[PDB]
């Protein structure tokens, strides 16, 4: 569900 590319620092 969450997009890993929304913020690459997470």
């Amino acid at each position: 569900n969450p997009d890993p590319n929304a913020n690459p620092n997470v």
Partner: antibody
Amino acid sequence: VQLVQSGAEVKKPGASVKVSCKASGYTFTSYAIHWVRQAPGQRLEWMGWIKAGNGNTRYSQKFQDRVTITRDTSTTTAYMELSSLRSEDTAVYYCALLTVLTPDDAFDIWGQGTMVTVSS
Amino acid sequence: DIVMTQSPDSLAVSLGERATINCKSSQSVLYSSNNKNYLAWYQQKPGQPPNLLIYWASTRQSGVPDRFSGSGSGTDFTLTISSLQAEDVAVYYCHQYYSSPLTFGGGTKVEIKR
């Protein structure tokens, strides 16, 4: 663990601006630097990020055509260039290490902000 | 576009009283496989950049005083200041890093009643 942005500028409608973000105090190539803008009265507004290591970028849909983020690994610096400047573009432009949440480390650092005014 | 909505827009309380800020995300911020909420809270004093207070919905960042706590899950989230001190005057933003584009709420201004 610091981010230092260039000074405030004024440009003519249609011109371009090139803000910079100098980083230090941490491994520069390990994390991505975002660009966020705070217009007067508006909520914070994400523009895009760049992976400091390999230079890959993602841009918000609102700024696809006019934004370009870059970086120079030697000087530890990221840049954000905005072209075709308009009245709405008067805002403070931040660079930030947004929520670096890794198993080893957890921090969040913002540049002090660069006020850009679009005016003749 | 996850729209972050905060309630109220302005909060005014006496020194030492409890203060609570509400954030409602338009879709769920929970990933059920790892049971984490992709939500943070920021503080912004005037003339300064935002300051990260809480991440993973409830995890406080080292350095932040204990009186700041976050809670909630899914689409409803609360930021509590258990005892408001004078320097807590500021605007408080929730922030979701669940979906692209990253988004912030509209901010909540906290004022002291004196």
